[PDB]
């Protein structure tokens, strides 16, 4: 079962992001945050830190009480279709509730 | 239950696309194609043709036998979160099989 863990991302010019990593067990599949341009995340391990490279993001709007907000979904490098699909399903399941 | 129907899209400079519209009953929710920049689709009705405006796309890679391929998911203008989530879940369900 998919879990979520707050995780820091970084891209060009040292711009960082905070977001949710979606993972299993602990293997990261994807990262959701509020900015474009992130290239990698610093992923907890024991340990310690593993750098996980990200694919260019999927921007998508969700409705919110303050109006539409743009989210950015980043799949991890080399992720397979089984896991890409699980990530999309998990995000779909979360988005439909809010 | 969500259905898919081949549908033509168009953007700046008259560039067109062919893609799959995801819909119910017949209310279109989203459009998946192979190019960026599409702004609207020409959506079958009886009828006839309704122009449906698209949000800027979510680019996402899927693995294929010829290597990774970039797809573009466009949600329709004003789509609510219930339907956005259903679309993401449907795409997740399709992507995990291939």
CATH number at residue A9: 2.40.10.250
CA dist., res. A74 & res. B17, Å (int): 25
Experimental method: X-ray
Angle (nearest 5°) at CA A72 between A66 and A77:
165
Q: Which residues, 6+ apart, have CB-to-CB distance to A69 below 8 Å?
A: A34, A61, A62, A63
Q: Report yes or no: B84 and A96 within 8 Å, Cβ to Cβ.
A: yes
A36 neighbors A57 (Cβ within 8 angstroms):
yes
Phi and psi at residue A63, to the nearest 5°: -75, 145
- The tally of domains found in chain B comes to 1
Per-residue CA distances from A22 to A77, B35, B36, B47 (Å):
14, 27, 26, 44
Burial class (CB in 10 A: 0-12, 13-18, 19+), A32: buried
Q: How far apart are CA A27 and CA A52, in angstroms?
A: 10
| Closest by CA position to A39, among listed A58, A23, A57, A65 | A57
Contact A71, A25 (CB under 8 A): no
**How far, in Å, CA of A45 to CA of B50, rounded?**
52
Residues of B in contact with A90 (CB under 8 A): 92
DSSP B13: G
- Residue ranges making up the domain that contains A60: 2-98
Radius of gyration of chain A (CA): 13
3-state SS assignment for residue A49: coil
What is the distance in angstroms between the Cα of A97 and the nearest Cα belonging to chain B? 7
Residue pointed to by tokens 């040292």? A14
Interface test with B, best of A88, A91, A94 (most B CBs within 10 A): A88
Which of A64, A45, A26, A79 is CA-nearest to residue B84?
A: A64
DSSP class of A77: T
> Residue B66, SS3?
coil
Question: Rounded to a whole number, what is the largest CA-CA distance in chain A?
Answer: 40
Query: Resolution for this model in angstroms, one decimal place?
Result: 1.8
Instruction: Give the Cα separation of B43 and B29 in Å (integer).
Output: 11
- Chain-centroid distance of CA B40 in Å reads 10
**A88 → closest Cβ in B75, B80, B88:** B88
Q: Which of A34, A19, A94, A98 is nearest to A63 (CA)?
A: A98
Residues 6+ apart with CB under 8 A from A66: none
A64 Cα to chain B: minimum distance (Å): 9
- CB contact set of B35 (below 8 Å; sequence gap of 6+): B15, B17, B72
For strand B27-33 and strand A69-75, is the pairing parallel, antiparallel, or unpaired? Answer: unpaired
Token pair 């800027």 in the structure block, residue: B56
Other residues' Cβ atoms within 10 Å of the Cβ of residue A21: 24
């Amino acid at each position: 079962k998919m879990k979520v863990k707050a995780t820091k991302g970084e891209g060009d010019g040292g711009i960082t992001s905070e977001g949710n990593a979606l993972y299993n067990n602990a293997f990261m599949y994807a990262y959701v945050t509020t900015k474009p341009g992130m290239k990698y995340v610093k992923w907890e391990h024991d340990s310690g830190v593993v750098t996980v490279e990200l694919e260019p993001p999927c921007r998508f709007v969700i409705d919110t009480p303050t109006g539409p907000q743009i989210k950015y979904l980043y799949f991890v490098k080399n992720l397979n279709n089984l896991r890409r699909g699980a990530v999309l399903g998990y995000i779909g399941a979360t988005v439909r509730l809010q």
